[PDB]
Each structure stands twice: as structure tokens, then as C-alpha cells.
Amino acid sequence: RSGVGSLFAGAHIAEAVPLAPLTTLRVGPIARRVITCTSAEQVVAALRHLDSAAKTGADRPLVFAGGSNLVIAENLTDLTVVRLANSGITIDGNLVRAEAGAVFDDVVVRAIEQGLGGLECLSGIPGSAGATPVQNVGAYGAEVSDTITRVRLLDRCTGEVRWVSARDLRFGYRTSVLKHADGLAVPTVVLEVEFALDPSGRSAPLRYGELIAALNATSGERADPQAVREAVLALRARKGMVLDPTDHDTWSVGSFFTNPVVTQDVYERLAGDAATRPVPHYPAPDGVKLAAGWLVERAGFGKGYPDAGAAPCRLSTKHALALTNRGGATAEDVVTLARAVRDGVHDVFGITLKPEPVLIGCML
Amino acid sequence: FAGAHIAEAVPLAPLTTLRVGPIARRVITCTSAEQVVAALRHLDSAAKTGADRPLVFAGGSNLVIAENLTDLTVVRLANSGITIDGNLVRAEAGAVFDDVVVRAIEQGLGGLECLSGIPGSAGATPVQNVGAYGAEVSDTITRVRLLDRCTGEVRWVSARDLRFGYRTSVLKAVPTVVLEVEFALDPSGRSAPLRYGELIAALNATSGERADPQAVREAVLALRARKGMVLDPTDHDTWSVGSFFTNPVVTQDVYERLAGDAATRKDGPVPHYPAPDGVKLAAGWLVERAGFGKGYPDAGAAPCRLSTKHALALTNRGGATAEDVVTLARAVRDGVHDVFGITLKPEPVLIGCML
Ligand SMILES: Cc1cc2nc3c(=O)[nH]c(=O)nc-3n(C[C@H](O)[C@H](O)[C@H](O)COP(=O)(O)OP(=O)(O)OC[C@H]3O[C@@H](n4cnc5c(N)ncnc54)[C@H](O)[C@@H]3O)c2cc1C
Numbered sequence: 001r002s003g004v005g006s007l008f009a010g011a012h013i014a015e016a017v018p019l020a021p022l023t024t025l026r027v028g029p030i031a032r033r034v035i036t037c038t039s040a041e042q043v044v045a046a047l048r049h050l051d052s053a054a055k056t057g058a059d060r061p062l063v064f065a066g067g068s069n070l071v072i073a074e075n076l077t078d079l080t081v082v083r084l085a086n087s088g089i090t091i092d093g094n095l096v097r098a099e100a101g102a103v104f105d106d107v108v109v110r111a112i113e114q115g116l117g118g119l120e121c122l123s124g125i126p127g128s129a130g131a132t133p134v135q136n137v138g139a140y141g142a143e144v145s146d147t148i149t150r151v152r153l154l155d156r157c158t159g160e161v162r163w164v165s166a167r168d169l170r171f172g173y174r175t176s177v178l179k180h181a182d183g184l185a186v187p188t189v190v191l192e193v194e195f196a197l198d199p200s201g202r203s204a205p206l207r208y209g210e211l212i213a214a215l216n217a218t219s220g221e222r223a224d225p226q227a228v229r230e231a232v233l234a235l236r237a238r239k240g241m242v243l244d245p246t247d248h249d250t251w252s253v254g255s256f257f258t259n260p261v262v263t264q265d266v267y268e269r270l271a272g273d274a275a276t277r278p279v280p281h282y283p284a285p286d287g288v289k290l291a292a293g294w295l296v297e298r299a300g301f302g303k304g305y306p307d308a309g310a311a312p313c314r315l316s317t318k319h320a321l322a323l324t325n326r327g328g329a330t331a332e333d334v335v336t337l338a339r340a341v342r343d344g345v346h347d348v349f350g351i352t353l354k355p356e357p358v359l360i361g362c363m364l
Numbered sequence: 365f366a367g368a369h370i371a372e373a374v375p376l377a378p379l380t381t382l383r384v385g386p387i388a389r390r391v392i393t394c395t396s397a398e399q400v401v402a403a404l405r406h407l408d409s410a411a412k413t414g415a416d417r418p419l420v421f422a423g424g425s426n427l428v429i430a431e432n433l434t435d436l437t438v439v440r441l442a443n444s445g446i447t448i449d450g451n452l453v454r455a456e457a458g459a460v461f462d463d464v465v466v467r468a469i470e471q472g473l474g475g476l477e478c479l480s481g482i483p484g485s486a487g488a489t490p491v492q493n494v495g496a497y498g499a500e501v502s503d504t505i506t507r508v509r510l511l512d513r514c515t516g517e518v519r520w521v522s523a524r525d526l527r528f529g530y531r532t533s534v535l536k537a538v539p540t541v542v543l544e545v546e547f548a549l550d551p552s553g554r555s556a557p558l559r560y561g562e563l564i565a566a567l568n569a570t571s572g573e574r575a576d577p578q579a580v581r582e583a584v585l586a587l588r589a590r591k592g593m594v595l596d597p598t599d600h601d602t603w604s605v606g607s608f609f610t611n612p613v614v615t616q617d618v619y620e621r622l623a624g625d626a627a628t629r630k631d632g633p634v635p636h637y638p639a640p641d642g643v644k645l646a647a648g649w650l651v652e653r654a655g656f657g658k659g660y661p662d663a664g665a666a667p668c669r670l671s672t673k674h675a676l677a678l679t680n681r682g683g684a685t686a687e688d689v690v691t692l693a694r695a696v697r698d699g700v701h702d703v704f705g706i707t708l709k710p711e712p713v714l715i716g717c718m719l
């Protein structure tokens with residue numbers, strides 16, 4: 001059938017591979033082996049062999065795609081990496097299907113240019129399509145759970161491949177069943193994602209105040225998707241949230257923390273504690289969602305922190321939530337600064353912020 | 365109408381499970397999605413309006429049609445393909461739903477088996493989130509291909525945008541027609557988990573176990589047979605639209621009032637089911653407790669009676685009219701309201717008639 005003569009059905013194998021340059025953060029160990037898969041058959045056959053042979057706590061493989069949400073400890077000297085390069089975008093009426101290794105922003109653009117609305121708010125988010133369901137990737141008032149119909153999944157332990165519905169993924173705010181406290185584990189691999197979009201050519205309803213203002217629209221109004229993408233790309237540039245290899249503010253894994261959901265009591269206390277001398281909140285179904293960025297800034301961790309020095313890890317000069325590599329950072333530098341922001345916001349507010357990126361061999 | 369078959373003066377009664385309906389002016393039978401879409405586009409722009417709107421039809425298992433609708437144009441969906449594609453099953457609107465179930469079981473795909481024996485088409489299933497025996501088609505549908513009748517536009521719509529709930533979806537005020545349904549099923553060949561007390565008991569198993577889909581099917585078919593809820597043309601208990609009323613979802617205090625009274629009278633407990641938004645009661649227990657036994661009325665030879673095996677099913681006893689169905693329905697609804705304070709809601713769609 002498929003690459004029968006070769007190991008892993010034809011996947012590329014390389015040894016002693018610096019992972020740092022493959023990551024947006026530019027942090028990482030030299031991987032002992034990298035196995036690069038360009039098809040679903042390769043991803044399945046590669047993991048089957050590695051999962052069948054893996055015996056010890058040093059042998060679980062790191063599944064790696066765009067490298068935009070990974071903080072990988074430099075200590076990990078005995079690491080095998082499976083790299084998902086199985087790309088491919090199909091248009092099927094108002095449906096768009098993207099293999100895991102497609103570049104997510106590419107899916108957005110293809111969708112917009114078919115006159116299909118629904119992804120435009122997610123323009124400029126880096127990384128792969130296959131990663132999007134894992135944490136229900138979102139920005140600017142949209143999330144991929146607003147349009148995903150189903151996901152093609154490899155269950156690594158049984159070797160079964162099937163399609164799973166959006167409903168069975170149990171999407172919530174920055175979560176799904178695929179999201180695990182441990183980001184190495186990845187017992188289930190996304191091979192392909194399908195989205196169902198709006199063939200009338202209208203964007204999703206605009207649900208995010210900064211974007212709405214920028215287009216001179218009102219809340220829940222629909223607009224031209226391309227115009228929405230252009231505004232979103234401008235909003236993201238201002239925050240250093242579009243990759244730009246000459247700008248260190250962009251040497252990140254984006255926002256380092258999820259917006260926390262607090263009980264209505266704790267929102268009203270802060271609403272009071274700041275009524276002397278207006279507290280950002282977003283609607284959410286089981287409490288109030290607070291802006292992590294407003295919390296981080298109020299606890300003293302502003303844009304550029306720490307300001308004095310040549311700190312190798314700073315918070316972005318354009319967006320306080322993003323940790324950045326200024327040139328020579330290590331994983332521990334990133335974890336250290338993140339811990340302090342996290343500890344600091346708890347000292348002030350009594351809110352524990354959860355990290356949004358995936359920390360391999362490091363914890364907070 | 366891109367090759368649609370057009371018949372004139374077609375009796376609808378024999379096309380309905382209730383054996384009630386008018387002689388339609390024209391029946392436009394569509395055997396492809398293209399015909400369905402061509403027909404509805406022309407007819408919907410032509411209509412001038414109320415009674416010129418066409419009735420969308422399919423399996424005839426959930427409709428009560430007034431016999432005096434002599435000017436009725438009907439579009440009958442008979443696009444019937446069924447495609448298996450790994451663990452995905454795609455069924456055109458006109459496919460027989462139970463054949464989709466059988467086809468999935470035959471391929472080793474689990475998830476549809478608890479829906480064995482429900483009559484009518486695949487296309488109709490999302491409209492009221494068809495279900496029984498602890499399953500609903502919302503548990504497996506990924507998306508539905510729809511014609512928006514207001515814009516003439518055709519598109520796939522996700523499960524989520526259909527807003528499925530207990531006997532409802534957004535399709536049940538935009539008319540749309542479902543053209544095709546996709547289901548994602550379980551290729552390990554295990555059933556959905558067994559959640560329904562009657563079915564678990566009948567298999568000798570535990571709540572949450574899975575079983576062979578075929579054995580689940582046979583159990584469910586035998587239980588449905590005991591209630592007159594599989595089509596059997598010699599049994600008048602099955603000349604129905606199934607359960608005529610949906611299980612009402614009441615605030616928890618309405619439930620509690622009832623459960624107190626029943627405990628005092630010693631005729632409890634009040635059977636009830638999970639609901640996100642209060643407590644769901646067995647409409648059948650309300651009907652019987654309000655005085656309307658299985659076979660009601662027993663006196664004389666009523667042309668409409670409640671099934672002798674399932675009180676919730678209004679049945680055509682030979683020669684019923686729509687007026688008889690609606691007259692019996694109104695009494696069962698009024699009596700339940702009078703005894704319990706609960707307003708039951710009709711499950712079938714009523715064309716030219718009302719409670
Ligand atoms: C400048 C910048 C801006 C950002 N803005 C946003 C934003 O607005 N919103 C947002 O949600 N995120 C944002 N991110 C985070 C990141 O881009 C997204 O999370 C992205 O979806 C990660 O994709 P990746 O392919 O790079 O994942 P990787 O970093 O390659 O992988 C990360 C984790 O996902 C797992 N994973 C990857 N592929 C699969 C698969 N196919 N199946 C199962 N598990 C898998 C990996 O094992 C690992 O556990 C931003 C990042 C940067 C650097």
C-alpha cells in the first residue's frame with residue numbers, strides 16, 4: 001500500500017536536531033531523533049512503532065507541529081520527536097478540510113477566498129491546523145469550536161483511526177478532551193480537521209469590542225471576511241501577535257496565561273475594590289471571565305518587564321501576557337519569569353492563572 | 365424540476381402511518397437533491413401565499429393531514445442513497461431511517477442500534493432530534509445538508525448550529541429542508557452505552573455497559589413490539605404517529621407536587637428523566653393517571669382510540685378522520701391539564717387541523 005520498504009512508511013529520520021530554531025520561542029534541546037511525517041500513513045506507522053517499543057519515562061515521543069505553543073526544557077537530551085508535516089487543504093462546498101500539518105492561517109485564507117465566512121477572526125494565529133482543536137484555538141471573539149464539525153483522530157494506544165464529532169471533543173474556553181495537564185502524553189493525535197463555514201460570504205458576528213470599533217461596526221454585525229482579516233492582522237501587529245522574525249516581542253508562545261473565570265462574588269469584590277477610586281470582564285457560562293492582561297499589569301508585571309537589564313526573558317513591550325526570548329533565553333528563564341507573574345497575580349488578587357502554552361519537562 | 369415525477373390527485377392516506385389525509389392536487393416526488401432543490405425554489409417563489417405553500421413530506425410517520433385540503437401541493441422526498449466512509453455514514457433525506465441503522469450494524473459501526481424500529485426517513489430525524497431507548501440522533505450527527513427555503517441557498521450545517529435538544533432543533537421561524545444527514549459512528553463495533561433502564565434490564569447488564577449492536581437492536585425491536593411501536597399493518601395499535609405527546613419538562617416543584625400527591629395516594633413513584641432545564645415526566649403515566657387507560661375509549665367502537673399497548677399513541681382504528689384524531693388529542697390534553705396542571709405538547713405536525 002504505502003512506503004512498504006521503509007521504516008515508518010517513508011517518514012524522514014534525522015539525528016541530533018536542534019529544536020530551538022524550530023520553535024517560535026527559540027528555546028529547546030537538541031533532539032536525539034526527529035521523525036518527520038508527510039502523510040497520515042506516516043504519522044500512524046511512526047507512532048505505532050514508537051509506542052510499541054517505548055519502555056521507560058525517557059522514551060515517550062514529543063509530538064511537534066508548528067512549534068508555536070511549546071516550551072521544551074533543554075535538559076531533555078534523550079528525546080525522540082514526531083514532527084507532523086502532513087499538510088493539505090480541501091474545499092468541499094461550504095466545508096474546508098485541513099490535514100494536521102497545514103498552516104492554520106492558510107486554511108483561513110483559503111476559506112475567505114471561497115467566500116466562506118467564519119475563520120476570519122482567527123487570522124494571523126501561527127502554527128498548524130491540527131493543533132487548533134487541542135486547546136480550542138481562538139482570538140477576537142471567535143474560536144475553532146464555532147465551526148469545527150469533526151476531527152479525524154488517531155488513538156495511539158489501540159492504533160484506531162476515526163472521525164470524532166465536535167460534540168465529543170467537549171470544547172470549552174481554551175480546552176477540549178484533547179487538552180492534558182501533561183502535553184507530552186498526547187494519547188490521541190489529530191490527523192485532519194473539518195470546518196463548516198458560511199457560503200454567503202459574511203463574517204461571523206463581530207463579538208469583540210476592539211475589532212468592532214476598528215471596523216466602525218456594532219456588536220453582532222457581520223462584515224466582509226477579508227476586511228475583518230485585515231483589521232485583525234492590524235490589531236495583532238500592535239500587540240506583537242503576528243510572527244516577525246526581526247522583532248523579539250514575537251519570539252514567544254503568545255499569551256502565556258488564559259483569562260481566568262471567577263465566581264460572581266469575586267468579580268463584584270474587585271468591582272468594589274476598584275470602585276475606589278472599571279474592571280474588564282467578558283461573558284462566560286459558569287462565572288465571570290476576567291482579562292488576564294489587566295490582572296498581570298495591576299500586579300506590577302507590565303510591558304517590558306523586567307525593564308532594567310539585558311534580561312534574556314522579558315514580557316513583550318507590546319503585550320504584557322507574552323513572555324519573549326530576547327536572544328539567549330533558556331527554558332528555565334521562561335518558567336522562572338512565568339512563575340513570578342503567576343505567583344504575583346495570586347498574591348494580589350487570590351487568582352491562580354493557568355498557563356496556556358504547553359510545557360514539556362518543566363512545570364511552573 | 366430537473367426530472368421530478370409529478371402525479372395529480374394522489375390520495376395521501378395510504379402514504380401516512382396514521383392512514384389519514386386528503387387527495388392532494390399534485391405530488392412532486394424528488395429522487396435526487398437536485399430535484400428537491402429545483403422544486404422548492406420554484407414553488408416557494410411562486411406561492412401567493414398561505415395554502416399555496418407546498419407540504420414537505422417524506423415517510424408520512426409524523427404527520428396529521430386534514431382530509432379537506434383538496435388544493436395541496438406536496439413535495440415528497442425520495443432521495444434515498446446511503447454511503448459508508450470509514451466510520452462516517454451519510455444518508456440522503458429520503459432514505460428509510462431503519463435501513464441506515466441496519467446498514468451501519470452490517471458494517472460494524474455502533475451508535476444507531478437503540479434507534480432501531482423508528483419509522484420514517486433519515487431526513488426527518490434532526491428536525492425533532494429523533495430518539496428512543498436512551499439515544500438521540502444528536503448523539504451522532506456531525507452535520508446536516510440543508511436548503512434554506514427563504515434564500516434558496518444550500519449548505520452543510522453543524523450539529524451545534526442545529527441546537528439540538530429534547531425533541532427539538534432550530535429546524536422545528538426559517539423553513540429549511542434537510543437533504544442529507546452525516547453520522548459519525550463507532551468503528552470498534554460496540555453499541556452506544558446502555559443508559560435506558562428497560563433496555564439494560566432486558567439485556568441482563570449494567571448501566572453504562574456496551575453490547576453487540578445487533579443484540580441491542582433485537583432487544584429494542586422486541587420491546588417496541590410489546591408497545592405497538594414497530595409498524596405492523598395488521599395491528600391497529602401501530603396505525604399511529606407513535607407517541608402523540610412529548611414528555612413534558614416541568615420545573616422541579618411541579619414534579620415535587622406530583623410526587624407528593626402520588627405518594628399520599630400510594631400510586632407512585634412518578635417516572636421521570638434527566639433534563640438540563642428541569643424534570644422530564646413520562647407523558648404516558650400522566651395520561652393513564654388522569655383516567656385515559658390503554659384502549660381509551662373502550663365503549664362503543666370509536667374510530668380513534670389510544671393504543672391498547674401504549675396509551676400515548678393515538679391510533680386510527682379503521683376509518684378515523686383527522687377530526688377524530690384531534691378530538692381525542694384535545695380531550696387527553698385537557699384531562700391531563702385538569703388533573704395535574706401540566707399542558708402536554710403534540711409531537712406530530714398538524715396540517716390544516718389543531719388541538
Ligand atoms: C505570536 C503568537 C501568537 C499567538 N496567538 C494565539 C491566539 O491568538 N490564540 C490561540 O489560541 N493561540 C495562540 N498562539 C498559540 C499557538 O500559535 C496555537 O496554540 C497554535 O494552535 C499551536 O500550533 P502549533 O502547530 O505551533 O502547536 P505545537 O507548538 O507544534 O504543539 C503544541 C502542543 O499541541 C500538541 N499537538 C500539536 N499537534 C497535534 C495534533 N495534530 N494532535 C494532537 N496534539 C497536537 C503538541 O504535542 C503539543 O502538545 C500564539 C502563538 C504565538 C507565538
Ligand SMILES: Cc1cc2nc3c(=O)[nH]c(=O)nc-3n(C[C@H](O)[C@H](O)[C@H](O)COP(=O)(O)OP(=O)(O)OC[C@H]3O[C@@H](n4cnc5c(N)ncnc54)[C@H](O)[C@@H]3O)c2cc1C
Nearest residue numbers: 420421422423424425426484485487488495496541542606
Ligand atoms: C409506530 C411509530 C413509532 C414511532 N417511534 C418514534 C420514536 O421512538 N422516536 C421518535 O422520535 N419518533 C417516533 N415516531 C415519529 C416519527 O416516526 C419520527 O418523527 C420520524 O423521524 C418522522 O419521519 P418521516 O420521514 O415519517 O416524517 P414525515 O411524517 O414525512 O414529515 C414530518 C414533518 O417533518 C418534516 N420533515 C420531514 N422530512 C424533512 C426534511 N428532510 N427536512 C425538513 N423537514 C422535514 C415534514 O415537513 C413534516 O413537517 C414514531 C412513529 C410511528 C408511526
Ligand SMILES: [K+]
Nearest residue numbers: 253254255356
Ligand atoms: K499561547
Ligand SMILES: [K+]
Nearest residue numbers: 605606607711
Ligand atoms: K411521535
